Amino acid sequence: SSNDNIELVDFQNIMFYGDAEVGDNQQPFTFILDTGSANLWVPSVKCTTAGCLTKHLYDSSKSRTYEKDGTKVEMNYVSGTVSGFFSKDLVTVGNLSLPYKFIEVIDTNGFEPTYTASTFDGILGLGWKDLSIGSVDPIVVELKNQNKIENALFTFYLPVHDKHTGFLTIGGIEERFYEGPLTYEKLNHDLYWQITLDAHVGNIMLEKANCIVDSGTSAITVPTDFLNKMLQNLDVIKVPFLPFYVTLCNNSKLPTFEFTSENGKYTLEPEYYLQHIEDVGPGLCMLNIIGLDFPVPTFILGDPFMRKYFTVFDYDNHSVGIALAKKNL
Amino acid sequence: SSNDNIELVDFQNIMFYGDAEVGDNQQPFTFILDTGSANLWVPSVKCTTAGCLTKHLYDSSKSRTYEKDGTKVEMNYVSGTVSGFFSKDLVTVGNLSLPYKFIEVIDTNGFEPTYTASTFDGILGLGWKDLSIGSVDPIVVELKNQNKIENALFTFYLPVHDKHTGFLTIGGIEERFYEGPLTYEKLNHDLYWQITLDAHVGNIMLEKANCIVDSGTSAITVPTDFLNKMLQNLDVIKVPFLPFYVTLCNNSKLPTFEFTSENGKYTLEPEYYLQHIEDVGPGLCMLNIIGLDFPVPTFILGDPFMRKYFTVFDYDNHSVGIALAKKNL
Numbered sequence: 001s002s003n004d005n006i007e008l009v010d011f012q013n014i015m016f017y018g019d020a021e022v023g024d025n026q027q028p029f030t031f032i033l034d035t036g037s038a039n040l041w042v043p044s045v046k047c048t049t050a051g052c053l054t055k056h057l058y059d060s061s062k063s064r065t066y067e068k069d070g071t072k073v074e075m076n077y078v079s080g081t082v083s084g085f086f087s088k089d090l091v092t093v094g095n096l097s098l099p100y101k102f103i104e105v106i107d108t109n110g111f112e113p114t115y116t117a118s119t120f121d122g123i124l125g126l127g128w129k130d131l132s133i134g135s136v137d138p139i140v141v142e143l144k145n146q147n148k149i150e151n152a153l154f155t156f157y158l159p160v161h162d163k164h165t166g167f168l169t170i171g172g173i174e175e176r177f178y179e180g181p182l183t184y185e186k187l188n189h190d191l192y193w194q195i196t197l198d199a200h201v202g203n204i205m206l207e208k209a210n211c212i213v214d215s216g217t218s219a220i221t222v223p224t225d226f227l228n229k230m231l232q233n234l235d236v237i238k239v240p241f242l243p244f245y246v247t248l249c250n251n252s253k254l255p256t257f258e259f260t261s262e263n264g265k266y267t268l269e270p271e272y273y274l275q276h277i278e279d280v281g282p283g284l285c286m287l288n289i290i291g292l293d294f295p296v297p298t299f300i301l302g303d304p305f306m307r308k309y310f311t312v313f314d315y316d317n318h319s320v321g322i323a324l325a326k327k328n329l
Numbered sequence: 330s331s332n333d334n335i336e337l338v339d340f341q342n343i344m345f346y347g348d349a350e351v352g353d354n355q356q357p358f359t360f361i362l363d364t365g366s367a368n369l370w371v372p373s374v375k376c377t378t379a380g381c382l383t384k385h386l387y388d389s390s391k392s393r394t395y396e397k398d399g400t401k402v403e404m405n406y407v408s409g410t411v412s413g414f415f416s417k418d419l420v421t422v423g424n425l426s427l428p429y430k431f432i433e434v435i436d437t438n439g440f441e442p443t444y445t446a447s448t449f450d451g452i453l454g455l456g457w458k459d460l461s462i463g464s465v466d467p468i469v470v471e472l473k474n475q476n477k478i479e480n481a482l483f484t485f486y487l488p489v490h491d492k493h494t495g496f497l498t499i500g501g502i503e504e505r506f507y508e509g510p511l512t513y514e515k516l517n518h519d520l521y522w523q524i525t526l527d528a529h530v531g532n533i534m535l536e537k538a539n540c541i542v543d544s545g546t547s548a549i550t551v552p553t554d555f556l557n558k559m560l561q562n563l564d565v566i567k568v569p570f571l572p573f574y575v576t577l578c579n580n581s582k583l584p585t586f587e588f589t590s591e592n593g594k595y596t597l598e599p600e601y602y603l604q605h606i607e608d609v610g611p612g613l614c615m616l617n618i619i620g621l622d623f624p625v626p627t628f629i630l631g632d633p634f635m636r637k638y639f640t641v642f643d644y645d646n647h648s649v650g651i652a653l654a655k656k657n658l
């Protein structure tokens with residue numbers, strides 16, 4: 001190697017996390033690393049929520065390179081909201097560093113009960129500037145301007161529970177991570193890491209669908225009506241009030257996602273997308289396919305897809321690369 | 330009986346619905362009758378959206394009493410968004426009826442998957458005027474200002490699946506529904522049906538807590554910090570990123586909720602917030618409790634609560650009245 005590797009820890013085969021620093025001193029945080037968004041936020045010390053009370057908090061008066069701003073910003077996701085103000089300081093990943101504009105968080109109730117339940121401290125976006133709030137040029141794009149990295153690109157090799165850890169690599173592609181050919185798909189918009197793919201599952205086919213590839217989503221997301229058509233030939237239990245379903249993890253009538261383009265064929269078997277709930281019953285699983293409508297019919301290939309597919313995110317080449325991940329490092 | 334009833338139909342143990350009709354012909358619909366909002370809306374015959382396929386729709390043309398208006402609106406719900414424009418025409422509930430301004434919806438896409446998954450057509454608000462978009466007097470206030478019922482008040486007797494249907498009554502109180510004394514709590518505000526009660530659960534006590542009585546909230550809603558302290562040592566399982574809490578139905582460690590004031594004490598014991606999930610696993614139950622945070626600490630006493638307690642909603646005397654519902658009519 002000769003690149004910047006940031007190690008990834010598994011949560012349960014559902015999420016993954018990875019650490020970075022802020023400020024010139026230590027000040028360590030646990031992050032959701034998120035191609036899904038394009039802001040960095042961090043829990044402040046001025047924060048008196050029940051939530052922050054369990055987290056590693058951030059101290060702006062104990063870092064020599066702080067730089068006040070205090071502009072109020074509401075940061076919203078599909079899963080919730082988070083509030084506070086802007087600030088600037090030295091963000092440090094792997095062993096690379098830069099001055100950066102990030103968000104200091106004072107309200108977290110919009111993201112509960114998930115925040116207090118989970119081990120992460122904050123969320124480090126990895127999208128494009130048009131997706132950012134307050135036009136912040138992505139870290140990786142800036143580490144190229146400061147000729148700190150070879151390429152304006154980053155790479156995701158995700159951990160599997162009883163096999164290996166994973167890495168986020170900045171600057172270049174490493175062969176150790178994948179086996180087989182990489183396939184590059186072009187972005188249809190410089191917003192989300194979004195590419196165009198025929199999605200089909202048994203008979204249900206959706207040609208030329210928007211596909212956002214998102215490190216900070218624990219499910220596969222599916223147009224709301226698409227899920228209904230799929231549900232029609234399954235035999236799963238509905239969870240009374242919620243849009244969630246339960247199956248045996250060995251139900252053979254479970255579908256494989258097939259996404260195809262001019263360049264590649266990527267499939268996602270049940271054994272990657274199911275969410276194991278051993279502690280509720282033996283061999284019992286959440287379907288972990290979620291109904292979610294956008295303006296455009298859209299599929300979020302999230303964590304489960306990324307557990308099987310090693311992926312390259314290329315700013316220079318406006319593209320996403322996709323290959324089979326190595327079963328073992 | 331002296332006042333008008335509307336029969337309440339049990340929606341698969343989950344929700345309940347009632348029928349009201351719109352226009353000078355009948356044109357019936359199925360509404361969620363809902364103390365937590367204060368607009369009436371009904372899907373248009375002019376509707377373009379997929380959701381509307383399975384629904385009763387409203388035809389201006391077929392009704393003499395229609396009155397053009399057409400100001401664009403957007404109704405917003407913790408659970409989604411629904412869009413259209415206003416119209417005035419003849420709302421009828423049971424068989425009291427009045428010219429009433431309401432929303433003709435034409436886009437339901439922000440209301441999925443709930444709208445296609447459920448079998449209601451509209452929502453009928455029963456909260457207060459300030460809750461409404463466009464400053465609309467509640468139906469039951471107008472019905473009274475126009476002298477069609479004795480008191481500006483409505484009552485709720487929820488169905489129980491295996492046992493009885495339910496009734497929304499308008500204008501009077503009916504002895505046949507409750508048992509023992511009514512007790513009345515002034516609202517703390519004329520917005521939601523919101524009173525102040527002391528919430529006590531384990532050794533966790535929240536004092537002077539805002540409580541919303543919401544016949545359209547399928548669960549009981551607790552502050553996220555309170556609910557997180559609450560689960561703590563009970564043998565419950567929060568499924569990692571879901572509001573999905575599972576236990577043994579006999580978990581003899583499960584607390585009774587206890588709300589109190591000068592006048593009364595309201596308990597809701599495990600048998601009231603537990604939904605049987607036999608199909609998932611033998612002897613298993615889920616806790617019908619959400620963790621939600623408003624700007625001020627709040628509880629929402631939704632359907633679970635109202636399944637135990639007959640509730641009286643009095644605009645005249647600005648209060649909620651609570652007495653134990655009859656086991657069987």
Ligand SMILES: CC(C)CC(=O)N[C@H](C(=O)N[C@H](C(=O)N[C@H]([C@@H](O)CC(=O)N[C@@H](C)C(=O)N[C@H]([C@@H](O)CC(=O)O)C(F)(F)F)C(F)(F)F)C(C)C)C(C)C
Pocket residue numbers: 032034035036037038075076077078079080114123214215216217218219221290300570571
């Ligand atoms: C999927 C559930 C069954 C389990 C669960 O809830 N998992 C959560 C989840 O995956 N949530 C996803 C999510 O919000 N991910 C988040 C992002 O990766 C995507 C994002 O929302 N990005 C923001 C920037 C977004 O698009 N927000 C938009 C707008 O603010 C922006 C706009 O429209 O331009 C939104 F708020 F949804 F409206 C994460 F990671 F939380 F930060 C969701 C299913 C997409 C995780 C604990 C986070």
Ligand SMILES: CC(C)CC(=O)N[C@H](C(=O)N[C@H](C(=O)N[C@H]([C@@H](O)CC(=O)N[C@@H](C)C(=O)N[C@H]([C@@H](O)CC(=O)O)C(F)(F)F)C(F)(F)F)C(C)C)C(C)C
Pocket residue numbers: 241242344361363364365366367405406407408409443452460543545546547548619
């Ligand atoms: C959450 C699980 C229990 C499953 C679930 O989805 N349950 C549903 C439910 O209870 N949803 C609740 C809800 O949205 N109830 C709804 C109302 O009772 C309250 C309301 O949203 N009121 C509005 C008026 C409100 O507070 N809006 C505000 C503002 O926009 C103010 C504004 O402009 O009106 C909000 F959207 F929250 F932001 C119902 F019925 F859909 F109408 C939710 C748990 C709070 C039902 C099975 C359909």
